[PDB]
Amino acid sequence: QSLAERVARLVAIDPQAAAAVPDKAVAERATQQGLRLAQRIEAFLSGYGDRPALAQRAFEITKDPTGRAVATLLPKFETVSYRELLERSHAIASELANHAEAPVKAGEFIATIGFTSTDYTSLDIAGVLLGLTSVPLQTGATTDTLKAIAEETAPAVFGASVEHLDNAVTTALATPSVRRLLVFDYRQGVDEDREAVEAARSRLAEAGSAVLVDTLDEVIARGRALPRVALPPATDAGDDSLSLLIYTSTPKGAMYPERNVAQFWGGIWHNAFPDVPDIMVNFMPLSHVAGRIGLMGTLSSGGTTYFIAKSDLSTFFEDYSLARPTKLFFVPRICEMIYQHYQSELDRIGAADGSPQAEAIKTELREKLLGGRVLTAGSGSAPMSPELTAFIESVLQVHLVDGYGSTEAGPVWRDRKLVKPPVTEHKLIDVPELGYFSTDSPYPRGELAIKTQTILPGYYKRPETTAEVFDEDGFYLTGDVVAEVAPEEFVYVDRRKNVLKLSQGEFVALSKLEAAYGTSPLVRQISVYGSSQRSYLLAVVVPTPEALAKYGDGEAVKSALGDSLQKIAREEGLQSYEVPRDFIIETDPFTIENGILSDAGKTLRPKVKARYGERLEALYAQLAETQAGELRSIRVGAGERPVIETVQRAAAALLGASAAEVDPEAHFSDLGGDSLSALTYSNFLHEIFQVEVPVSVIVSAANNLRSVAAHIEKE
Ligand SMILES: Nc1ncnc2c1ncn2[C@@H]1O[C@H](COP(=O)(O)O)[C@@H](O)[C@H]1O
User: Fold this and answer.
1) What's the burial of 264, exposed, middle or buried (CB within 10 Å: 0-12/13-18/19+)?
2) Starting from the edge strand earliest in sequence, which strands make up the sheet with 523-529, in order?
3) Ligand 1: does its nearest atom lie under 6 Å from the Cβ of 491?
4) How far from the centroid of its chain's Cα atoms is residue 42's Cα?
5) Which residues 6+ apart lie within 8 Å of 134 measured at CB?
6) How far is residue 234's CA from residue 223's CA, in Å, rounded to a whole number?
7) Separation of 281 CA from ligand 1 center, angstroms?
8) 101 Cβ partners below 8 Å, 6+ apart?
9) Largest CA distance in the chain
10) Could you tell me if the CB of 248 is within 6 A of ligand 1?
11) Residues 115 and 568 sit within 8 Å (Cβ to Cβ)
12) By C-alpha distance, which of 238, 228, 160 is closest to 200?
């Protein structure tokens, strides 16, 4: 049933939903021609002033009976109003501009490590009100890459949530431009939080740093009693002032000028995925554009965002079931987690996939776990297997809009269809080297190139890298191979990076195989791997906890996995060479913490390579190396052993048989051996015994391994 209808029905029943319906008078004021970014924000936030804007889990400070005070979360959320959000943002800008010994002025850089929360959001806004350039850093970046980014940007202020404070300190000690360290998501009364700050200031004192440390609490309490800074900020370049850098990947900073940041705030990104009330959960760091799109789309539509309680997603279902969102934004790995929930719940009940009992599990997901108020849903940032899409769609009972886009280009398509605006022109470029051409069947393929109104001005302090991503006609080269399936309708194949050429000249799209194989019930996470010297694929598989218990982590989980991936291969119409033949089994999941997952939740190929690459190569190497060691052992001992043993071992080794299935009565034909492999075998035998053995003596169904051993001995 239609969206207008489902909304109308919700807003009759649900006063919370009714109060969150967008107000057009506010949107017209905030979006009018000429208004600078900071003024656009001020208009949304004052215009919706009384409404609930943001929500965090309520808590109480408990004592252990250790004695220590700690924050104990409650099954309840608490809201900060749009007006309260605006005040505290202004209190931050005011205190930062007016500081007595280390003030900050428009144009200066601020860097931040944090998750996503009320404080982080209010610091983002403070930055725009001050005209700062903000550089939000990846929560799982190593300290080395944090220092490298702090080097390029030279920030004057460094902000960090309590839990990243230690890595912030390390980075600030290596970064002479940093004058202040601000500490946020800080809770007065919590002993962990107080001792983190005291450790930060001892560490800085001990190294003799003059870097000042303050919590955001205190910054705001000071700012509150100060006059507001004047809008818009006195930057150098109006709408082209550099407002944000988003780091992408080696890390490059994509420049977001004020006019492109403004698109998050009620501009072109609301097309990315009637007057719908926006109530959303946010699980995505502000380090990544997906965090922003939800967060600012909802701020700018007068809705409410509910922040997930813990960085590590361990409170996911509880928060969704309390917050009961109207809009869902997913990424594949989140849909996979949902699918993994359904599937382990399916084992535990002992029900099959098509059944009423399984449909109740879905119903539970839809009504309880996800809150039962879902009106729309979208996904993006990585490719979704069609099976998973249909699963999510059946659970939610809405269409899952697919949005393709990038940090660089902004939103590019929505359910295959170019989003115009901002896209003005496009084309496909052939990629001969990866075997992709506009003449291909059944569809034209190649690299998508675009001209778009939201294209980045460039990468920060990287003019050469900036020139690499445009072709001679000024089209942006997405790096992404696509398939045109109808006029101006595209489907994603893969990044150019992710396409591998196997040694027999077949081309694989690696990220597409991971999406496909991620709906194996045995698979928790998968990374597929290739080498151009090899004719088959490997994979790094984290099996599910259930698979581990049932099969272990040795040959039996590999063999089970194999069957499972074969079955997807056949069902999806993939080739035999697209199925991995062996595995590295990992019992410890890829995480953001580990460096294997990005802040968006994507599996990072080069981080898999750096960790597992050696073990994977050694696994490619060992197959032929064992066989070669055996052939050499047999060559070396043959002038002193029963000719029949030689014949058997040679046959076993060459074809891939266990000694068990090599009987002296077996036919070379039985053990997998065509007449091409019989010539290799004849040559081997000729080399060690000095006697001629025709390929007739091996392939003839008259003969068997005694027959062969017989022939040789008669000479
Ligand atoms: N909806 C989507 N489907 C498939 N791949 C996607 C989608 N959105 C983004 N991507 C991939 O993610 C990249 C964006 O990377 P980033 O710059 O980190 O956001 C794109 O260039 C694609 O390779």
Assistant:
1) buried
2) 523-529, 538-543, 582-585
3) no
4) 33
5) 109, 110, 111, 112, 124, 127, 128, 243, 244, 245
6) 20
7) 21
8) 212
9) 107
10) yes
11) no
12) 160
Burial string for 583-619 (b: 16+ CB within 10 Å, else e) reads bbbbeeebebeebbbbbbbbbbbebbeebbeeebbee
* Separation CA 376–CA 705 (nearest Å): 68
Cα 686 to Cα 690: distance, rounded to the nearest angstrom: 5
The DSSP result for 514-581, as a single string, is: HHHHTTSTTEEEEEEE--TT-SS-EEEEEE-HHHHHHH-SSHHHHHHHHHHHHHHHHHHT--GGGS-S
| Domain with residues 623-714, CATH architecture | Orthogonal Bundle (1.10)
Q: How many H helices and E strands in the chain?
A: 25, 25
Residue 713, classified by CB atoms within 10 Å of its CB into exposed (0-12), middle (13-18) or buried (19+), is: exposed
Say how far apart CA 649 and CA 627 lie, in whole Å: 11
Please give the helix or strand (H or E) that residue 77 lies within, else none: strand 69-81
Q: How far apart are CA 154 and CA 462, in angstroms?
A: 15
Q: Would you state the structure tokens that stand for residue 26, as one six-digit string?
A: 């506010």
Q: Which two tokens stand for residue 71?
A: 């924050």
Regarding the beta carbon of 492 and ligand 1, being less than 6 Å apart is answered yes
- DSSP state letters, 387-434: HHHHHHHHHH-S-EEEEEEETTTEEEEETTEE-TTTEEEEEEE-BGGG
Q: Where are the alpha helices (DSSP H) in 116-254?
A: 118-130, 143-153, 165-173, 191-206, 216-224
| Distance (Å) of CA 118 to CA 28, 99, 327, 398, 616 | 26, 23, 20, 30, 43
Name the experiment that determined this structure: X-ray
Does residue 416 contact residue 545 with C-beta atoms inside 8 Å? Answer: no
By DSSP bridging, strand 499-501 and strand 523-529 are unpaired
Are 627 and 684 a contacting pair, CB within 8 Å?
no
Token representation of residue 713: 């001995």
* CB 380 less than 6 A from any atom of ligand 1: yes
Which residues touch 240 (CB under 8 Å, ≥6 apart)?
257, 258, 259, 457
DSSP 235: -
Quick check: CB of 404 below 6 Å from ligand 1?
yes
Question: Is the minimum distance from the CB of 381 to ligand 1 under 6 angstroms?
Answer: yes
DSSP-based three-state secondary structure for 606: helix
Which two tokens mark 280? 């959303």
Beta bridge partners of 55: 79, 306
Q: Is 437 helix (H, G, I), strand (E, B) or coil?
A: coil
Separation of 564 CA from ligand 1 center, angstroms? 27
With H, G, I as helix, E, B as strand and everything else as coil, classify residue 504: coil
What is the resolution of the experimental data for this entry, in Å?
2.3
Helix (H) or strand (E) holding 59: strand 52-63
Binding-site residue numbers are 288, 381, 402-403, 407, 480, 492-495, 501, 602
Q: Report the 10 Å Cβ neighbour count for 15.
A: 9
In contact, 74 and 59? CB cutoff 8 Å? yes
Tell me how long the chain is: 715
Close Cβ partners of 401 (under 8 Å, ≥ 6 residues apart):
273, 376, 377, 378, 379, 414, 415
Secondary structure class of 644 (helix, strand, coil): helix
Mutate to test the pocket of ligand 1, among 329, 480, 491 (most ligand atoms within 8 A of CB): 480
CA–CA gap between residue 94 and residue 126 (Å, rounded) = 9
